[PDB]
């Protein structure tokens, strides 16, 4: 019944300071648990960063030297990560988790938040519909898509019909080309339900405050 959620900038410049917030709901942080930060690098290596426990006790990974501080705001039931003097090596997905003293976290981890360390600039994606060139077999399936092109940094979120279309979607990992990412998403639906029912992809890029819907129309 506990829930944890990370928040903070998805882009930080080199030599600057990374700050993240873990908001805890459903359980008090002035407790005997290790309220901890973990990160996962591109390539998927996991690293323990540190914890705060019982409000005033902390411990940090020696790898982080004196760059790291973990603090809390009891009034807001939040704990914080500060990581100073960042480099590109600090690009990672950051997670908060509640560890008990025996190592048990259950599934009390946040969803994670992506932090990219780069001098490059926030760029919004252009979103393009992928319709089929001609007609394909009816009373079968039809695949449609969206091309989410030229954004920085990660991530983007793609849904279809605002989440109503969940099965038969494949959202592919972004590819990086010249400091810009490109991703495609496909969706497969009964050729019965298109183009008779509308199919639209919803693309969000939080970093640039972008939120675009693109309706897939027969060409």
């Amino acid at each position: 019944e506990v829930k944890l959620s990370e928040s903070g900038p998805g882009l930080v410049k080199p030599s600057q300071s990374l700050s993240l917030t873990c908001t805890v709901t459903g359980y008090s942080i002035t407790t005997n648990y290790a309220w901890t930060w973990i990160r996962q690098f591109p390539g998927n290596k996991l690293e323990w960063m540190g914890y705060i426990r019982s409000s005033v006790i902390t411990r940090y990974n020696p790898s982080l030297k004196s760059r790291i501080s973990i603090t809390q705001d009891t009034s807001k039931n939040q704990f914080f990560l500060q990581l100073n003097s960042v480099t590109t090596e600090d690009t990672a997905t950051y997670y908060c988790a509640r560890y008990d003293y025996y190592g048990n976290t259950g599934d009390y981890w946040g969803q994670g938040t992506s932090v990219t360390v780069s001098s490059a600039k926030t760029t919004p994606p252009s979103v393009y519909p992928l319709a089929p060139g001609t007609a394909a077999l009816k009373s079968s399936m039809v695949t449609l898509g969206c091309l989410v092109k030229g954004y920085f940094p990660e991530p983007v979120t793609v849904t279809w019909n605002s989440g109503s279309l969940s099965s038969g979607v494949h959202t592919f990992p972004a590819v990086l080309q010249s400091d810009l990412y490109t991703l495609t998403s496909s969706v497969t639906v009964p050729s019965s339900t298109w183009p008779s029912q509308t199919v639209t992809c919803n693309v969000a890029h939080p970093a640039s405050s972008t939120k675009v819907d693109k309706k897939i129309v027969p060409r």
């Binding site: 996991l46 323990w48 997670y95 025996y102 599934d107 494949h170 592919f172 590819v175 495609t184």
Partner: protein, 216 residues
């Protein structure tokens, strides 16, 4: 510090089979209190790590009894009984006896299922993109097994390798297949100078390439 090692699985596992995954530590994880401080996590594709086992053999709340942990103080095994499609992902051990509470490098579990041909779809550049001065041709090769696949592009009958970018999904948690996107990016000018575009998939399930084409 303690060094944690996890071994590769050499083979994919069929739904229903059981599989054992190994983790080793250079130092004993048995503590003074008689407990052994070793965790196992599953990270499913696209998700946060989820703990399965802590103290070497204790299941977390809600964790299926299909997952069982055993070991000495230095060699540990996670046994996954009666594997389900949803078990696919990477299994990490983590020592919890001393700083820096190191995670192992992970062991990926792949599910073995029946071979399935890719469903291939091709998409001309959108009119919106053409306006912008660019032209991306997109091909999806969806829900195939096994993961090994080749994609080839042809423009007016001649193979094209430059300007192709590929992306591949992790194994699907529901049907144990893989999917791939292939995008051929050209300038609007380049795109207008040719007529026939073909995406061609070579996969074990077909002697001939499975091709999708359109004429500009």
């Amino acid at each position: 510090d303690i060094v944690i090692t996890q071994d590769e699985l050499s083979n994919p596992v069929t739904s229903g089979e059981s599989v054992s995954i190994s983790c080793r530590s250079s130092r004993s994880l048995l503590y003074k209190d008689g407990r052994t401080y070793l965790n196992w996590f599953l990270q499913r594709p696209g998700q946060s790590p989820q703990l399965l086992i802590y103290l070497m053999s204790t299941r977390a709340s809600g964790v299926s009894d299909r997952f069982s942990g055993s070991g000495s103080g230095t060699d540990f095994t996670l046994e996954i009984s009666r594997v389900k499609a949803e078990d696919v992902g990477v299994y990490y051990c983590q020592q919890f006896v001393e700083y820096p509470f190191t995670f192992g490098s992970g062991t990926k579990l792949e599910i073995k299922r029946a071979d399935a041909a890719p469903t291939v779809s091709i998409f001309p550049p959108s009119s919106e993109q053409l306006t912008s001065g660019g032209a991306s041709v997109v091909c999806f090769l969806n829900n195939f097994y096994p993961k090994d696949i080749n994609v080839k592009w042809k423009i007016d009958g001649s193979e094209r390798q430059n300007g192709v970018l590929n992306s591949w999904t992790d194994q699907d948690s529901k049907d144990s297949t893989y999917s791939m996107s292939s995008t051929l990016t050209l300038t609007k000018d380049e795109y207008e100078r040719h007529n026939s575009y073909t995406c061609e998939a070579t996969h074990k399930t077909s002697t001939s390439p499975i091709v999708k084409s359109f004429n500009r």
